[PDB]
């Protein structure tokens, strides 16, 4: 397993059981654990570890966790950012996994934003 780290506020992603998807500072939490598997042969889906669940950046900009594999917004493509960081990007929305700083879990187009820097790291 690997975790997923914000950069700048150092909180990991975190897949709940309920669905929802959101950053903590809690490293002994077993949810923040993930799987990173081939989608073809340029994607990737990120699956939580312990709940069988794939992170989904929604048209909306929302971000949950689904067991559907057949819905086309749980791939993503993981591109270098220079140092050891990365950004998350949704192929089908174009949209960047971002963790505020409350905590909260969703996605923007804005490469420019500090927030969507990831560090990957294994457990
Ligand atoms: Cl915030």
Not at 1 to 29: A, W
Not at 91 to 102: A, K, S, V
């Amino acid at each position: 397993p690997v975790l997923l780290k914000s950069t700048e506020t150092g909180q990991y992603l975190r897949i709940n059981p309920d669905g929802t998807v959101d950053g903590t500072r809690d490293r002994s939490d077993t949810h923040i654990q993930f799987q990173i598997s081939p989608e073809g042969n340029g994607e990737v889906l990120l699956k939580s570890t312990e709940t069988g669940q794939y992170l989904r950046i929604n048209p909306d900009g929302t971000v949950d966790g689904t067991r559907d594999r057949s819905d086309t917004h749980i791939q993503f493509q993981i591109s270098p950012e220079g140092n050891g960081e990365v950004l998350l990007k949704s192929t089908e929305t174009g949209q960047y996994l971002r963790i505020n700083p409350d905590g909260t879990v969703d996605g923007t187009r804005d490469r420019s934003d500090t927030h969507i820097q990831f560090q990957i790291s294994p457990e």
